[PDB]
């Protein structure tokens, strides 16, 4: 779930990703 590009950290998809 952790993005290589830091500008992703607060994206809809990363947040959804953490909602395993």
């Amino acid at each position: 779930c952790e993005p290589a590009n830091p500008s992703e950290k607060n994206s809809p998809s990363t947040q959804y990703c953490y909602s395993i």
Epitope: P6, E8, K9
Partner: antibody, heavy 121, light 107 residues
């Protein structure tokens, strides 16, 4: 002229630390992720980490997590990578590269000329 | 980190020949990237998103592939093509590069 400027070379004493610069121009520095890549003849091109200048947010490769520290300065539009307690294995070429377009997928479309580091006493 | 294996290590090509180089990944990736690197210089974006050509990259170059198997191919080898070509992936963090296939001109 979208460009990334890095010093040509740095000589570091084994044990010391070195902070490398990577000045950017021709685009707004705070809307793109800056990446750093390591290169040696033996271990190839290795991704170290990245930083987003508009946030300060950083991302690391586990391999260089305790070796590199990434920072960015808004006013001078410069990215920095500090290498701590350098050993012979750190002698290599270091690149900074901007990434863009998450769409299809990311793209390293702007690279720096690379700063060659030699660690020797 | 996904492992990208390139082949051949060295590819000898006569001027005018049509050659191809492959790239295989330890596990599936959505797109593969190619960079050209002449010695002493920084690697140059050559192909992005599997099949697209970067700015100033001649039509002789092309790329395709899927899942774990990709390839870069030159339709007409020219002198200025000598260099190492590198494979690259963004599907997994940390993003990784391949070992590179060195192309040399058999003139």
């Amino acid at each position: 002229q979208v460009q990334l400027q890095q010093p040509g070379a740095e000589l570091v004493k084994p044990g010391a630390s070195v902070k490398m610069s990577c000045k950017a121009s021709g685009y707004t520095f705070t809307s793109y992720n800056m990446h750093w890549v390591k290169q040696t003849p033996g271990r190839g091109l290795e991704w170290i980490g990245a930083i987003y200048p508009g946030n300060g947010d950083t991302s690391y490769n586990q391999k260089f997590k305790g070796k590199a520290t990434l920072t960015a300065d808004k006013s001078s539009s410069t990215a920095y990578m500090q290498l701590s307690s350098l050993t012979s294995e750190d002698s290599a070429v270091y690149y900074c590269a901007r990434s863009t377009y998450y769409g299809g997928d990311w793209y390293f479309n702007v690279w720096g000329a690379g700063t060659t580091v030699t660690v020797s006493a | 980190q996904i492992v990208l294996s390139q082949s051949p290590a060295i590819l000898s090509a006569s001027p005018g020949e049509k050659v191809t180089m492959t790239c295989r990944a330890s596990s599936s990736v959505s797109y593969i990237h190619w960079f050209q690197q002449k010695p002493g210089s920084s690697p140059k974006p050559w192909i992005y998103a599997t099949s697209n050509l970067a700015s100033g990259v001649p039509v002789r170059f092309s790329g395709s592939g899927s899942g774990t198997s990709y390839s870069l191919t030159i339709s007409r080898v020219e002198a200025e093509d000598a260099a190492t070509y590198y494979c690259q992936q963004w599907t997994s963090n940390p993003p990784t590069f391949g070992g590179g296939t060195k192309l040399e001109i058999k003139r």
